[PDB]
Symmetry: C2
Subunit: 279 residues, 2 copies
């Protein structure tokens, strides 16, 4: 099955005890018949912990993307056995999908370290990818340059994780406007009870002058409401400064289409790893 090639680099840096993964480029990706081209990007992670995933920038309308991106996994050399590098090429669109054009796995036991690995390898078929299920959140972003008004509409969520024993969840979403690690504003949606697919369609606005929009970050977190007890977050995602892949594309599209609300689905990630990226 012809799915194209991926050029990558692999190297263990004994100095800083970290694995270096390079996503150079992909070639000959399958040509769509329902679209024409693809908006490819690569997710990079190490099994068995599909918690931490990295993403390349999403490339527009192409079957031969050149990424030139580097990623890092802090792992002690003596803990490499049992781990597998996964490089999945996704086809972007504003949906929850997970359209895996193809992928390439590299079991650490097949790698000759102490020498730099850099090569092309054919992409293999794959429908589902090892993923931690927390659900998807859907929201729209709209920015009016002149007025300096940022509008975030929390539309809906689906397949949320079950936070209530012998039940579902009581999901609510809160937004955090941030700038340089500093919390500028907070917002919270109403609470929906007993559901994994809440529908909100609640709009919120912020005042972000054009001279700042380029430095802020909008953090969206979905949590479960618990009357008697702590409200545990089920997952989060953020867009704006330093965001990557799909999140960066969402933010960019917003800036490219002033005055228009761009809606898009995002895959929720574990609160801990998203916080490290906002760090």
């Amino acid at each position: 099955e012809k799915l194209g090639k991926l050029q990558y680099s692999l190297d263990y840096d004994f100095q800083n005890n970290q694995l270096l993964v390079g996503i150079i480029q992909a070639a000959e990706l399958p040509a769509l018949d329902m679209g024409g081209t693809s908006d490819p990007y690569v997710k990079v992670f190490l099994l068995p912990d599909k918690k931490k995933k990295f993403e390349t920038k999403v490339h527009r309308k192409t079957l031969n993307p050149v990424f030139n991106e580097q990623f890092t996994f802090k792992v002690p050399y003596s803990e490499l056995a049992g781990k597998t590098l996964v490089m999945a090429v996704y086809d972007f669109d504003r949906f929850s999908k997970h359209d895996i054009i193809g992928e390439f796995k590299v079991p650490m036991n097949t790698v000759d370290f102490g020498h730099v690995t850099e090569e092309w390898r054919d992409l293999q078929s794959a429908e589902k990818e090892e993923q931690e299920k927390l659900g998807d959140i859907c929201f729209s972003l709209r920015y009016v340059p002149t007025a300096g008004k940022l509008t975030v509409v929390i539309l809906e969520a689906k397949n949320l994780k079950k936070m209530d024993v012998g039940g579902l969840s009581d999901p609510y979403v809160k937004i955090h406007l941030m700038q340089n690690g500093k919390r500028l504003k907070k917002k919270k949606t109403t609470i929906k009870k007993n559901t994994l697919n809440p529908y909100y369609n609640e709009s919120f606005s912020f005042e972000v002058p054009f001279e700042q929009i380029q430095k802020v970050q909008v953090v969206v977190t979905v949590l479960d409401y618990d009357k008697i007890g702590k409200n545990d977050a089920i997952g989060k995602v953020f867009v704006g400064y330093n965001s990557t892949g799909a999140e960066l594309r969402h933010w960019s599209d917003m800036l490219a289409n002033p005055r228009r609300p761009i809606a898009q689905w995002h895959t929720l990630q574990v609160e801990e790893e998203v916080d490290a990226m906002l760090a």
Copy 2:
């Protein structure tokens, strides 16, 4: 004449007394040079400076590039009159074609500040672009990941500026391997006398382990030899970390084609402005 559209943003930031220029995207670029498409990028400068230009990343094989890039010009509001913003869309080539697809000028006197300008405007015809003439330098880059060997071959130069009264120049080139503002190595070619188009074809090597190649910078400077007196640089250019446009493409191509020498012509820039970018 159909040359495509450019979407840009313009705004004066009275807070930091600087002009903000945004190059969002271009559409319908004419299907020309290099076959089916082009490798577009935009040079941005404020006339009558002409000496300081900025460049967007070069986008591969496309007639509808989305840049999402921001640039800054520190200019006092009271010194804006008499200045013109120039946004020229070039088509990338490894030769010294300096081919302009189209351009769009914005005289400051036509801008209504105190309000964000963001729009599309058709590109206009243009052959030559206001340029400070210093000449072009041609060199090749080759990198061997495993061996950690970086090879720079100074091939030749052309149209060098005349540094000798009632004569031409006595050009020589020196290379600076840098890392984090720190000078790691130096190299110098032989000296060619009385010429504006010297031919060198001199090769040099550096030891840059794979775990560092991603952080170094190769600075190439062309100077005029003067026996009795100071050797004045005619111009320079650099590639690697933080390099942009054509320079970044050269560096990337090197990394994408290990073990192969990638040759390319570069337009020399004034020593002062290049140093500010290496700052």
